[PDB]
Scaffold this active site. Structure first.
Site, short mmCIF file in Angstrom:
data_model
loop_
_atom_site.label_atom_id
_atom_site.label_comp_id
_atom_site.label_asym_id
_atom_site.label_seq_id
_atom_site.Cartn_x
_atom_site.Cartn_y
_atom_site.Cartn_z
N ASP A 140 39.98 13.93 -9.89
CA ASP A 140 41.20 13.47 -10.99
C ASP A 140 40.87 13.64 -11.89
OD1 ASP A 140 44.26 13.75 -11.92
OD2 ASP A 140 44.60 11.60 -10.60
N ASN A 169 46.73 17.98 -10.61
CA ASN A 169 46.93 18.68 -11.84
C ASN A 169 46.37 20.61 -11.72
OD1 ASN A 169 45.79 15.40 -12.70
ND2 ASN A 169 48.12 16.39 -12.78
N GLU A 198 53.65 13.55 -12.03
CA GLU A 198 53.91 12.62 -12.12
C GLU A 198 55.07 11.98 -13.04
OE1 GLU A 198 50.84 13.56 -12.14
OE2 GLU A 198 49.92 12.14 -13.89
C1 LIG Z 1 44.63 10.81 -14.26
S1 LIG Z 1 43.74 9.56 -14.42
C2 LIG Z 1 42.75 8.95 -12.66
C3 LIG Z 1 43.76 8.59 -11.82
C4 LIG Z 1 43.98 7.93 -10.72
N1 LIG Z 1 43.58 8.81 -9.95
C5 LIG Z 1 45.19 7.40 -9.99
O1 LIG Z 1 46.17 8.51 -9.88
O2 LIG Z 1 45.63 6.61 -10.37
C6 LIG Z 1 42.17 10.89 -15.20
C7 LIG Z 1 40.67 9.16 -15.01
O3 LIG Z 1 39.57 9.43 -15.12
C8 LIG Z 1 38.80 9.42 -16.19
N2 LIG Z 1 37.26 10.45 -16.55
C9 LIG Z 1 37.87 11.39 -17.41
N3 LIG Z 1 35.99 11.70 -17.08
C10 LIG Z 1 35.35 11.13 -15.96
C11 LIG Z 1 34.55 11.53 -15.64
N4 LIG Z 1 33.61 12.97 -16.18
N5 LIG Z 1 33.46 10.91 -14.74
C12 LIG Z 1 34.69 9.25 -13.81
N6 LIG Z 1 35.71 8.73 -14.79
C13 LIG Z 1 36.26 10.36 -15.77
C14 LIG Z 1 39.24 8.56 -16.98
O4 LIG Z 1 38.44 7.52 -17.79
C15 LIG Z 1 40.72 8.17 -16.63
O5 LIG Z 1 40.72 6.78 -16.60
O1 LIG Z 2 48.11 14.63 -19.14
N1 LIG Z 2 48.60 15.08 -17.97
O2 LIG Z 2 50.53 14.91 -17.67
C1 LIG Z 2 48.00 14.42 -16.95
C2 LIG Z 2 48.29 14.13 -15.77
C3 LIG Z 2 47.46 14.52 -15.09
O3 LIG Z 2 47.76 14.04 -13.57
C4 LIG Z 2 46.09 14.06 -14.71
O4 LIG Z 2 44.90 13.05 -14.43
C5 LIG Z 2 45.65 14.00 -16.49
N2 LIG Z 2 44.61 13.79 -17.03
O5 LIG Z 2 43.60 13.18 -16.38
O6 LIG Z 2 43.60 14.53 -17.83
C6 LIG Z 2 46.96 14.43 -17.73
MG LIG Z 3 46.24 13.58 -12.07
#
Ligand SMILES: C[S@@+](CC[C@H](N)C(=O)[O-])C[C@H]1O[C@@H](n2cnc3c(N)ncnc32)[C@H](O)[C@@H]1O
Ligand SMILES: O=[N+]([O-])c1cc(O)c(O)c([N+](=O)[O-])c1
Ligand SMILES: [Mg+2]
Ligand SMILES: [K+]
Length: 214
Positions: A140, A169, A198
């Site tokens: 994610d 996603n 979400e």
């Molecule tokens: C969609 S959020 C994660 C949400 C979490 N899984 C949740 O549902 O609560 C995406 C996250 O991945 C991180 N991210 C992006 N590229 C990454 C990478 N190459 N390695 C570790 N984290 C990364 C971003 O900084 C961000 O915090």
């Molecule tokens: O843009 N979005 O709606 C999302 C939703 C998501 O659930 C993601 O994980 C996201 N992302 O990591 O880039 C972006």
């Molecule tokens: Mg996501």
């Protein structure tokens, strides 16, 4: 000033019941529904995530992308004692928030937070983190890492027969090249779970890809 992520954390610290993981999740979801959207997996898709954890009972779980710790908390709360979640997060500030969120939720004993990129940390998991093979992986993070991290996991020998990959996603924003690879490949058995983005009515889905061996 402050950031949205600090504002989500503030809301939880101020409204959720300390040590109650379900309470923390509801506090986050209510805030994000009512105040500001954030990219947590959220309650609807979170239920699908719960079912996969309850169905597979992973003892070594890897998360790629921690953000504010919603999904960490969501998954760690369902794990048996001695089970561990390793979550990788590239952003140190999000990692700081994730750690506090996990502490507050009462699941800190189950979680091992690593600050760094997935691509950098994955090849170190056997030597530096005492992993042999993974039981489950929740993907994610940024969607362009889904396919190459999956290939990295395989090549680093971290997958075994029955290892569960669960990707958020896969419809929105979408992860087409990951889907094509796992769906077309004889090394994965895939199931799609349609749901919603979400906090929204935009359609999304998750992909469950079970590794069948090399
Ligand atoms: C969609 S959020 C994660 C949400 C979490 N899984 C949740 O549902 O609560 C995406 C996250 O991945 C991180 N991210 C992006 N590229 C990454 C990478 N190459 N390695 C570790 N984290 C990364 C971003 O900084 C961000 O915090
Ligand atoms: O843009 N979005 O709606 C999302 C939703 C998501 O659930 C993601 O994980 C996201 N992302 O990591 O880039 C972006
Ligand atoms: Mg996501
Ligand atoms: K397949």
């Amino acid at each position: 000033g402050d950031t949205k992520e600090q504002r989500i954390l503030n809301h939880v610290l101020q409204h959720a019941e300390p040590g109650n993981a379900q309470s923390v999740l509801e506090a986050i979801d209510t805030y994000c529904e009512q105040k500001e959207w954030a990219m947590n997996v959220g309650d609807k898709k979170g239920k699908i995530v719960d079912a996969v954890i309850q169905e597979h009972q992973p003892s070594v779980l890897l998360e790629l992308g921690a953000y504010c710790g919603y999904s960490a908390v969501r998954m760690a709360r369902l794990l048996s004692p001695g089970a561990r979640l390793i979550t990788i997060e590239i952003n140190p500030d999000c990692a700081a928030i994730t750690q506090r969120m996990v502490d507050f939720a009462g699941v800190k004993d189950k979680v091992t937070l690593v600050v760094g990129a997935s691509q950098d940390i994955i090849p170190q998991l056997k030597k530096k983190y005492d992993v042999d093979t993974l039981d489950m992986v929740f993907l994610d993070h940024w969607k362009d890492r889904y396919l190459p991290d999956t290939l990295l996991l395989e090549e680093c020998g971290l997958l075994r027969k029955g290892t569960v990959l669960l990707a958020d996603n896969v419809i929105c924003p979408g992860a087409p090249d990951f889907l094509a690879h796992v769906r077309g490949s004889s090394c994965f058995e895939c199931t799609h779970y349609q749901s919603f983005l979400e906090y929204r009515e935009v359609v999304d889905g998750l992909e469950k890809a079970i590794y069948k061996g090399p």
